Amino acid sequence: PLVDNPQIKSAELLRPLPLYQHAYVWPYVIVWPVFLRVYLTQELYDKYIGAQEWTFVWIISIVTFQTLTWLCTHWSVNLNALFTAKKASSIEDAQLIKVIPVANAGAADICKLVRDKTNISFLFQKRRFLWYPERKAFSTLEFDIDAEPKPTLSKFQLSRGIESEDELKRLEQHYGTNTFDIPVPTFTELFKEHAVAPFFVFQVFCVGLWLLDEYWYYSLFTLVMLVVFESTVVWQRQRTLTEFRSMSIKPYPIYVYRLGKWTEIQSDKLLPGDLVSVTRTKEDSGVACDMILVEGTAIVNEAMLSGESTPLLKDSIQLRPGDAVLEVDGLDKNSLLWGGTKVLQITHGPASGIPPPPDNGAMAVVTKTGFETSQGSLVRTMIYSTERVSANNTEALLFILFLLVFALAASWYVWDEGVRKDRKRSKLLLDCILIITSVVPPELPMELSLAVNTSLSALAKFAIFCTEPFRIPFAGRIDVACFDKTGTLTGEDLVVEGIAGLGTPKEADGAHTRMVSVHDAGMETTLVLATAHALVKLDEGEIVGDPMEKATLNALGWVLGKNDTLTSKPGNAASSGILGTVQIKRRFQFSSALKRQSSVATITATEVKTGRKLRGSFVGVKGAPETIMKMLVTVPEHYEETYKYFTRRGSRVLALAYKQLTTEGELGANKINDLKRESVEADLHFAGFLVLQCPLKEDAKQAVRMLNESSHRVVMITGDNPLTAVHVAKEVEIVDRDVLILDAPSLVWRSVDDKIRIDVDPTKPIDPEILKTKDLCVTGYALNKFKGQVGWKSLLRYTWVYARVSPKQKEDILLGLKDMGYYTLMAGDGTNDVGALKQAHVGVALLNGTQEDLNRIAEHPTLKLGDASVAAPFTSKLRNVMAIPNILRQGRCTLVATIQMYKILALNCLISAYSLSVLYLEGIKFGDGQITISGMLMSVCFLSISRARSVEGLSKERPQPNIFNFYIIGSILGQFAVHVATLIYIAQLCDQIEPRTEVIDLEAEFKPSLLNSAVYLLQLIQQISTFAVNYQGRPFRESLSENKGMFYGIVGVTAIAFACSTEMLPELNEAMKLVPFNENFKTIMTTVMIIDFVACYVIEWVLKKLFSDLRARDIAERRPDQLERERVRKEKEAREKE
Ligand code: ALF
Ligand SMILES: [Mg+2]
Secondary structure (H helix, E strand, O other), rough: EEEOOOOOEEEEEEEEEEEEEEEOHHHHHHHHHHHHEEEEOOOOOOOOOOOHHHHHHHHHHHHHHHHHHHHHHOOOOOOHHHHHHHEOOOOOOOOOEEEEEEOOOOOEEEOOOOOOOOEEEEEOOOOEEEEEOOOOEEEEEOOOOOOOOEEEOHHHHHOOOOOOHHHHHHHHHOOOOOOOOOOOHHHHHHHHHHOOHHHEEEEEEHHHHHHOOOHHHHHHHHHHHHHHHHHHHHHHHHHHHHHOOOOOOOOOEEEEEEOOEEEEEHHHHHHOEEEEEEEOOOOOOOOOOOOEEEEEEEEEHHHHOOOOOEEEEEEEOOOOOOOOEEOOOOOOOOOOHHHOOOOEEEEOOOOOOOOOOOOEEEEEEEOOOHHHHHHHHHHHHHHHHOOOOOOOOOOOHHHHHHHHHHHHHHHHHHHHHHHOOOOOHHHHHHHHHHHHHHHOOOOOOOOOOHHHHHHHHHHHHEEEEEHHHHHHHHOOOOOEEOOOOEEEOOOOOEEEEEEEEOOOEEOOOOOOOOOOOOOOHHHHHHHHHHOOOOOOOOOOOEEEOOOOHHHHHHEEEEEEEOOOEEEEOOOOOOOOOOOOEEEEEEEOOOOOOOEEHHHHEEEEEEOOOOOOEEEEEEEEEEEHEEEEEEEEHHHHHOHHHHHHHHHOOOEEEEEEEEOOOOOOOOOOOEEEEEEHHHHHOEEOOEEEEEEEOEOOOOOOHHHHHHHHHHHOOEEOOOOOOOHHHHHHHHOOOOOOOOOOEEEEOOOOEEEEOOOOOEEOOOOOOOOOHHHHOOOOHHHHHHHHHHHOOOOOOOOOOOEEEEEOOOOHHHHHHHOOOHHHOOOOEEEEEEOOOOHHHHOOOEEEEEEOHHHHHHOOOOOOOOOOOOOOOOOOOOEEEEOOOHHHHHHHHHHHHHHHHHHHHHHHHHHHHHHHHHHHHHHHOOOOOOOOHHHHHHHHHHHHHHHHHHHOOOOOOOOOOOOOOOOOOHHHHHHHHHHHHHHHHHHHHHHHHHHHHOOOOOOOOOOOOOOOOOOHHHHHHHHHHHHHHHHHOOOOOOOOOOOOOOHHHHHHHHHHHHHHHHHHHHHHHHHHOOOOHOOOOHHHHHHHHHHHHHHHHHHHHHHHHHHHHOOOHHHHHHOOOOOOHHHHHHHHHHHHHHHOOO
C-alpha cells in the first residue's frame, strides 16, 4: 500500500485542477447559455414556460442543482477527489494526498505534502508521516530506540548531547517541537464548519419554502430557533475542546547540556538526543518528555499512566556493562521515566567526564518528544482518532424513510384530489411539496449526543470524569460486571494481626494456632521485617510507599534514617529486644510473575537478652508461601496445614524468610553488583508468617447488593490466593451456595473444608450436576490448561470467582466473555488491570483518593481533567465503590430519555402533516399568527419538559436499546391512528354543520371559517396531549405530578387551550382570528378532545406495561431462593424504617 499503518485503509496521490475545470463550473456554464437562448426565442416556447411562474421553477431547480453540486465537495471526501482532483502519474508531480482511515476509527481527510531539505512529509490527524524511497511508501517517524538493531548502552552512557548547531537545526526540522497541538477555534470557524451540514441546509431550504407562501412570522421564528440551536451546539463543542485542551503541561525552565555548556532552556524546546538535568518537579507539573536515566536515582509516582499512587524507585544505567551488552526493555524497565508522571524525590546515591549540573539533579537522555510518547499517543487517540456518539446513522435514516412513506401517500392523494377538480398546478405542487417537507424532523439523528452531554455533566457532578463519550450508551445494557479484590473492594489502612509459625497448641489437621505478638519475636524475624521493605522516606519528613509496609513499620516500632537506614539503638520500651542498625544496599522490585521481594543489606544487630551478635551481609525475602517452598532448604512438617487454617478465615498471610551470606564484614560491591536473581534466591531458611486482617470498604456490601438485585451479574477477578478470594466473595455476597475450588494438588476439584476431592480430565466435558448444584471458582493455572478443549465455553458461564490470574489472562477472560455477545464492565485501580480495562466495553479506574484533598483545593469540586488519568476511559477521584452503580444508572437514564424524544418527535411531525392535508383538500390555508402561536407554545412546552431529575436507586427493568421494536412502532401507530380518526370525524362533522360553497378562488386573505378553527384547536390539543402522555418517567425518573416545573407549564397551556375552546374569553378568540361557536358544537368538540386524550393514554399505558420490559439475559437469571431472600429483606427494611 501507499502508507504502512494498521489504521489507514487506502490512499492515493492527487493533483488540483484550475477553477474552470471544476465539476460545478464548466457543465453549468455550458447549460446556462442554452437555457437563456431557449428563453429568449419565441417559436421554441412550447416547453411549458408560457406561464411566468414556471421560469421561477426552472431557475430554482437549476440553482438547487448547482448548490448541491458545490456542497457535494464538502459533504464527502471521495466526491471531492472526483470533482476537484485529478490522479497523478508519479510522486514527483503529486500535490495532495487523500487518506481514508480504517472504518469507525476517525474521519477521512485530504492533506498537503511538504518537501524540505529531499524530505517528503505530510500531516494527518496531527501525526507526521514521512516518505521512504527504499520501501516506496509513507510511514510513521522513527527514533533511536525503535531501530531494528538494538543499540548498545554505550550510545547512551557516552552521549554528550548534540554538539553541532547544524545538527540541532536538522533535528528540529525532522521532528517537531515538544508540545501538544490542540488549538481551539473561534466561534466563526465552528459556525462555518457547521453551516454546510446537510440538515442545516435542509432547514434553510424548508424556511425558504415556507417564505415562498408569504408566511413571514413563522419563517422568522423558525430561523431564530435554528440559529440559537446551532449556537448552543457550537458553545458545547467549544467547552468540550477547552476541557480537553486543559490536559497539557505548562512550560517550566530546565537545564540542558548544549554545545558543551549548561543552559536554561524552556520545556517546549526539547529535542531527541538531548542531555537534560531532571530535578524535583513543582506543583501541578510533570516531566516534559520520555527520558532514560544515565546517572542518578529517582523516586517517582506514575499516577497518570497506571492509576496507583505508590511510589517507585527508578535506577540509573551507569552500572550496567554497556561496552558490548545490547539494550533490552524487559530488563531495563526500571530505568525509563515515562512522560506525564510526577517526580517525588531525586538522590545521587561520570564516564564521559561531563561536569555536573548546577542544580544537583539527576542526568537523563531524551528518547521521544511530542505526540509520539505513550501519553501523547493515548491523548491523540482520545481526541481525534476515536468513535463518535452515533457513528452509524442507520436506524434514524430508516425511521425518516418510514415517516416519508406516509408523507408520500398523503401528498399523492392530495395531488390526485386537486387535479380531479382542476386546481392551479403550481399552487397544488407547492402544497404537495410543503406537505412532503413538513414530516422530516431535522434533529432525529441527533438527540442522542445532547443526552450524552447532559449525563456527562451530571456524572461530573459526582466527581466522575469520562474521556470517551461514546461508551455512555454501552452502560445502558451492561450484563456482566467485573471487580478486583486488592485496592478496590478492600481498604487501604491495614492492621497487623501478628506473626506465627516461628517455632504449642495443635488442631486435628496439624495446624498451629499459636499467636505471637509483634513486640516479642525472633531475631531473624524482626531483622527481616526491618530490612525487607520497599518503603522510602522523603527529605521533607513524610513517609510514603506500600500501606502494608507502613503498617508493619508502625507495628515494628523502629525509626527510619536519612541515608535509607533503619535503627533502634536508642533505648525504647516499644521494641524491647533486638537493636542496632541495618543499611539496605540493593532492592528488587515486585512483579506480577515472581510474587516475591528480596533485599540485601549490611546488618549490625544485637540482642540484649541472650547476646547472639549478628554482623555482616544479609538477604531477606518475603512473599507468597508457595514460592518460599520452591526456595526452601528445609520444608516444615506443619507448613501447609497452618497456612491453610490461617488463610481460611480471610486473613492475608505473607511468608518471611532469611539468609546470611557472610558471617563477618561487608560482601563487597564487586560481587554485590555481580549477584543475580537466581543466585541470591537459593538455600534459604524460614523466618515466619506475617498474618494481617484486610478490612472491607464500608460501601462494598451496598453497591454489590444493588448491582446483584438489578438486571446484572457480578463476577470477581483477582490475583490473590483462592481461599482469601472465596472468603471475600462470601462476605460480599457474590456467592451464596457452597463453592468448590479447582486446582492442581492434576486438575482436581477440592472443597473449602477439604472434605471432598474429585478427579477430572481436561478433555472430557464437565459433569452437569457440578455446574448446576454448586458454584465454581477456577484458578489461573487450569484456565491456562483449558485453552482449547470443549469445556472452555461452559467454564466461562457458570463460575463467578477467579484467583491467581496473570494480567494477560484477565484480558483473555474479558475477551472470551465479550466473544459470546455479553456486554462487560470492569473496575480496577492497579497496574495489574491496565491491560484489561481497555479491552472491556466500559472501564473504571478507581483512583483511591481522599475527599479531604478534593475539598482542600482553592486555586488562587468539579475540578478539571488535569488531575485525572488516562489508564481507563472512566476515572473517579473518590474511594467509594458506590460510584460504580451511578454510571450504571446515568446511562440507564440517557437511553430512556432518547427513547421518549424519538416518540414525541415522530408523532408531532405526523400530526402536523395530516392537519395540513385536511386544510389542503378545501383550498384554505393556515394563518400566520395561529401557526406562530402554536410554534411558540410547542417550544415553551419542550423547554419545560426537557428538564428532569433522576431516581436515587436502580430498578429491575431495563430500557429498550434500539429504535425498531414492538413498543415504539406500536405506540406511534396507535396514537397516530387515534389522532387521524378524531381529525377525520371532526372534519366530517364540520362539513355537516356548514355546507361547502365549492367556489374555489385563491384570492383569499384568510377569511375566518369553522373548519380552520376546528382543525387548529384539535391539532393544538393533540400536540399538547402527545407532549404530556409520552413522558417516560415512571420507573427510572420521577413522575409528572412529583415535579412542578413541567407540571405548571403543562396545566397552564392546557388551561389556555381549554379557555380558547370554551369561549370563556371572547377577546382571546378574536386575537387569534377564530369564528364564534354555539353550544352543541362546543360540547361535541370538548367530548371529542377528551375521548382522544383518554384513548391515547390507555393505548400508551397498555403498550408500556406489555412490551417495555427488556428481559434479563440467561447469565443474570436468579434462582427463586435469592428472590425470596430479597423480598424478605426488603419487607424487613420496610418494617424497620420506624
Ligand atoms: F490488585 Al489486583 F487484581 F489483585 F488489581
Ligand atoms: Mg488491584
